[PDB]
């Protein structure tokens, strides 16, 4: 189960919420959030589920997440 992997993304989600100034769950949809746990390609564009989040903020949030995902791999 890759559910535990979301816990790592959840950490970035909290930091991402600070920049947006809104709640963390609001950043992603309840159904979409579940899809992220099931999928773990490492890249948001590869997720095939990127929408609304695309924009200048995507440049600030996204590439750094890839680095965070690799950290979850343990190396």
d(CA 22, CA 39): 25
d(CA 55, CA 11): 21
| Residue 57 DSSP symbol | H
* Domain boundaries of the chain, sorted by first residue: 1-75
Residues 6+ apart with CB under 8 A from 20: 26, 27, 57
Q: Cα–Cα distances in Å, from 56 out to 24, 33, 53?
A: 19, 21, 9
Angle formed by the axes of helices 63-73 and 3-20, nearest 10°:
150
- Top CATH class, 1-75: mainly alpha
d(CA 15, CA 68): 12
According to DSSP H, which parts of 21-62 are helical?
24-27, 30-38, 44-47, 56-60
Burial 1-37 (b: 16+ CB within 10 A, else e): eeeebbebbeebbeebeeeeeeebeebbeeeebeebb
């Amino acid at each position: 189960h890759d559910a535990p992997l979301f816990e790592a993304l959840r950490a970035w989600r909290l930091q991402k919420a600070k920049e947006l100034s809104l709640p963390p769950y609001t950043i992603f949809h309840d159904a979409t959030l579940k899809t992220i746990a099931e999928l773990r390609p490492g890249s948001h564009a590869t997720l095939g589920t990127v929408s609304g989040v695309g924009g200048r903020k995507l440049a600030a949030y996204g590439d750094e997440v890839l680095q965070v995902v690799r950290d979850s791999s343990g190396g």
